[PDB]
Amino acid sequence: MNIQILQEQANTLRFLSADMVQKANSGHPGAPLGLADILSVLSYHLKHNPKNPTWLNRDRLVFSGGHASALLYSFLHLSGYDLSLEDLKNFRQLHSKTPGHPEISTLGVEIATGPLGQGVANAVGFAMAAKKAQNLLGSDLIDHKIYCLCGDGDLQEGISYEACSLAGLHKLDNFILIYDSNNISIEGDVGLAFNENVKMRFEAQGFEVLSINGHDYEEINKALEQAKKSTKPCLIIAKTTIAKGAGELEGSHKSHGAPLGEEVIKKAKEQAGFDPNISFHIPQASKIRFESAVELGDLEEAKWKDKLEKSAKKELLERLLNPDFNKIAYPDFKGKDLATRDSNGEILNVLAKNLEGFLGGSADLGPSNKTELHSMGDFVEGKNIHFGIREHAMAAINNAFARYGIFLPFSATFFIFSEYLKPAARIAALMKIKHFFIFTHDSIGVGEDGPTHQPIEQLSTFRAMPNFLTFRPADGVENVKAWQIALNADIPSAFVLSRQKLKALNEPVFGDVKNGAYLLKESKEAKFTLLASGSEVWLCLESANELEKQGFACNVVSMPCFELFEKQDKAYQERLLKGEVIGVEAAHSNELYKFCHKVYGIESFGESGKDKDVFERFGFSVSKLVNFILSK
Amino acid sequence: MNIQILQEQANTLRFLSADMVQKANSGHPGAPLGLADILSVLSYHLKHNPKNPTWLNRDRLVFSGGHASALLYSFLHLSGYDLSLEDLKNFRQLHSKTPGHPEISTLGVEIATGPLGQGVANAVGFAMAAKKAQNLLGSDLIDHKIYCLCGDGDLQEGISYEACSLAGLHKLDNFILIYDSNNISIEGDVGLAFNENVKMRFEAQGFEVLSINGHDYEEINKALEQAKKSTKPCLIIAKTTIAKGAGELEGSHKSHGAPLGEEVIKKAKEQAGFDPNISFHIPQASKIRFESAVELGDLEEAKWKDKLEKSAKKELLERLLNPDFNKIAYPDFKGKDLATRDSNGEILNVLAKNLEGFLGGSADLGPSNKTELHSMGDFVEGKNIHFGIREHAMAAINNAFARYGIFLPFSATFFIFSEYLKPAARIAALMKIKHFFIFTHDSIGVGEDGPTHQPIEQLSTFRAMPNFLTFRPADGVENVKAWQIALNADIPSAFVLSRQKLKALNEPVFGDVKNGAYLLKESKEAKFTLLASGSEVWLCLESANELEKQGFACNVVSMPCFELFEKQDKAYQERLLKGEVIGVEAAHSNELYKFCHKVYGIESFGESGKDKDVFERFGFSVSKLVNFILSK
């Protein structure tokens, strides 16, 4: 470790990154160039095995400024991960392993980033997950760091303050946040929009704060040594120059998000002692030095595996890595009238008891969402996590729990406030992680709290989001079957649950919850089919009975999951959807026109009043629905 | 102003609030009881006219903890606003003037609150709007305060840190934030989830911070006098006891969100010297003292009107209050191929030039969203607001600009990051305010940045949200017509705009943009109708020309606004939607099944690659769409 080798290594990273952006004619060269000295020093401190990116006790590295992807990919390549030089040459191209922002399908990428702020919160989540993993498995087996690189944009986002609040509270002395402070954003000088005392901000949240020049190798190294010894979460404020090394583009906002240009790169290479006429050059000394991570990480992982072999926690780790969902005996809710928040809370408790890695919490609404895991204690010793009023950071934190390697997390709030965490839910979907979203208080049935607390459009949002099952169970039995599918699925799920008591259903007549929609009532030569979910299913059952008394044969379809129903074959859908099909939901759900001729929904915002008063006002009564169905 | 009258006034507020919650058997009595001493003192400082809640230079009061509604309503009633005692007795009842959280249809309510954090950001917005109003009209005409009451929940939300960052930057010495620090939330002790040094946090953001006992009248008054003289935004940290005055429920989390109970209220009244056997009692001295606001506010408004009469800014205020949208000469984009972000940026500049109160900005993406108002300067002297990377607080701030009385604000970001501000967009919709949302980079056409930056489900979300027009113009001419409707509408609008160049359309054949969907091509005996919006309209025009060459008569429908089309009469919709109707959009838009037999959309997340590569991968080519339409 000396200046000449560190300079060569950092410049190798710079010019790989610049060359990648240039070949693509797209991307972000400024942050890579600004960060290249820090990452060169950090490569000496990072404990990781490039040949086994799943090693449980690896240090976790997060690039919250995911636009700096070319630098990440340069580093993964150089360090010996399964990412080739040819992969680097296909930066930002269709179907490459080097997409414009990082994706977990690229080995070595810990978590997808891009939407600013998320990475900072994910890094907090990894640090909390590491603290829990240490509680379970012991400090002999879990003792690693979590490093996050972030920029101005990350620290302006609300989610960064939310997550960092939690990091200070939980004394996350495994978390090192490195802030690239380059005074530049897309609109130019960061001073146009931000002038906080960042050191005071973070000290207020319980961090130790170090302040460095991010192009001085000795200072970077000294800060990392001191950070690694901290008794607090630590922030390193690193003053850098955007596009450092790129001559006329140094410090320019124009370097943020467009290629540097061929001539700028040539001049830059000249100044650094690189040949301007070659691209994608990796000097020998740098190549050997970066790739030493392979030998060193192999040895560290071997040492760890030896500690695991001696551990009393071997069998526990095996259960955490291989949960048996089929063994679980769920509650039997057959014939029991209940609010689905209450059925769901019972199920959460059964899962927490059966699954040592199943945990989670609510954003200050445990008692209302019914998510308390009774007698299972508070984090870190126990399983209940108190996220505070921090819906967005809760979801981004739990995204990281779901990536850590041994956890099955849930996030809970009122369905209306799903909107506060939706960007993080989207990242769960993009990554196809197993993270469960618990959303209670699902409709105008909320009643008195009024229209700011009454969901209308949120069902449409979650249904429209790809890679995300949205279950809206009509009773406890549906709620169980929903969980059984969710645990076995390869994508995340949300559970949309009532405040109010719902009536238990009779048994399926044809199909079941796994088909997304199924029949509760089936009539030969049906003139009408009433299709509903959740709280509206009994309205439909009753309306269908009135229609039958008037001489109309009816099917009734329960649809606890739209997305699953979309996947059924045509013969199945045809058997359910007979005659004139009317969909009925306390939501503004135009998507039901995919399966229904008519939709009996809610097209406005709600009203503050008693639940029965509000449902009647919005037309959810047997008399009104029957009059609609009979068109008069 | 003495202790005996202040105590009686505060207890009047307590027991009105308690009695209201109790009669409704629903609501939040804890915060009202905790806040009653502060609001009693604050009533002496607040400058307002109960008989004219639109008085432009009134102090603006915001209850960010909108669950404390019963206290707000008690105060409005007592002060002489148009809210009756009978209204108080219909708290939380269907169609009352006293809904569970405050709504602007209740006179005296400055902004709808309920979703935590929003109010704090709205209060920052009112303070910024006041600073701008002072820039325009002079400090002789604008010199009022903005008071915000907030709780733990507000200050844990990210949006509160975002907005308070901006308040410190902009030196908002008209903003007084009063934090009800009662150590209690729904999950119990706030320490389970939050332990920041709140004074240090706010000092880091450029605030003066005062710390008081919120049940000591002299200390409250002294803090307000000092706050009103501050050269910084000021935070008053007020230590209170939740449900103060309610005996066994004092300091209990059970008082947060459920009625205190009849016996608890009786005991409370006994201890305060009120008759336990009467409800909704207003003592004479308190009644006279609170209602003195009527005489005092009438006199202050009269004095102000005299200052207005002498002002050089009289004619300007009249133009601000009565904008003439019909006079505006928009750009003529007929036959011009352009990205709709670029057409839209030109329109923004024309509006900013024509309308003295039209202003706004982007969340660090001015250069990319094309929202710079060229040569119109930076806030406060000018019109461009640099929100930073703070999408959520931007929207909540602009909600308040739209409520202030003289402004027409826009908020801008990439459409994918609309998700970060959606809860505040919902409040714009709930209030039916004129606030315009500018969302560029609307589809997989984004290209290289990849799936985290490529909208899929966001169109469904905004369409599903009530009271919100979502325009997705196919060319510059549609973009203009969209603005013309948006300015005349009684609800907010979003503009969903391309990164990439789009082809100019030919003229409408039947209907126009004001109908939501209209015909570009109409054929007798059409076998197919191709319906699209935005960037997909030319695909449809070309595909329809290929279908015609193969012998199939086709209609082509441009649908720049789904919500407007939903409002057209059946005869109009029937003329457009002929034969087999296929909807085509680069979105996962199942809502199109409302108007289409088939939907040719995107059902997954996107991909990082060149825009032309990504569109081809996802099927957006004439050959592929024609093969789909011909079912083979």
Ligand SMILES: Cc1ncc(C[n+]2csc(CCOP(=O)(O)OP(=O)(O)O)c2C)c(N)n1
């Ligand atoms: C939530 C969110 N909003 C907006 C963006 C677009 N964006 C990408 S980077 C950037 C500026 C970030 O600057 P910094 O974080 O300061 O980037 P650096 O320029 O210094 O490379 C923005 C607004 C985003 N990726 N995510």
Ligand SMILES: Cc1ncc(C[n+]2csc(CCOP(=O)(O)OP(=O)(O)O)c2C)c(N)n1
């Ligand atoms: C964004 C958001 N999340 C959750 C809620 C539900 N909620 C209402 S008040 C509250 C606790 C707020 O506590 P404080 O603000 O501490 O209320 P106080 O109990 O002291 O009356 C919560 C979680 C909400 N209204 N908005």
Ligand SMILES: [Ca+2]
């Ligand atoms: Ca920066």
Ligand SMILES: [Ca+2]
């Ligand atoms: Ca509180």
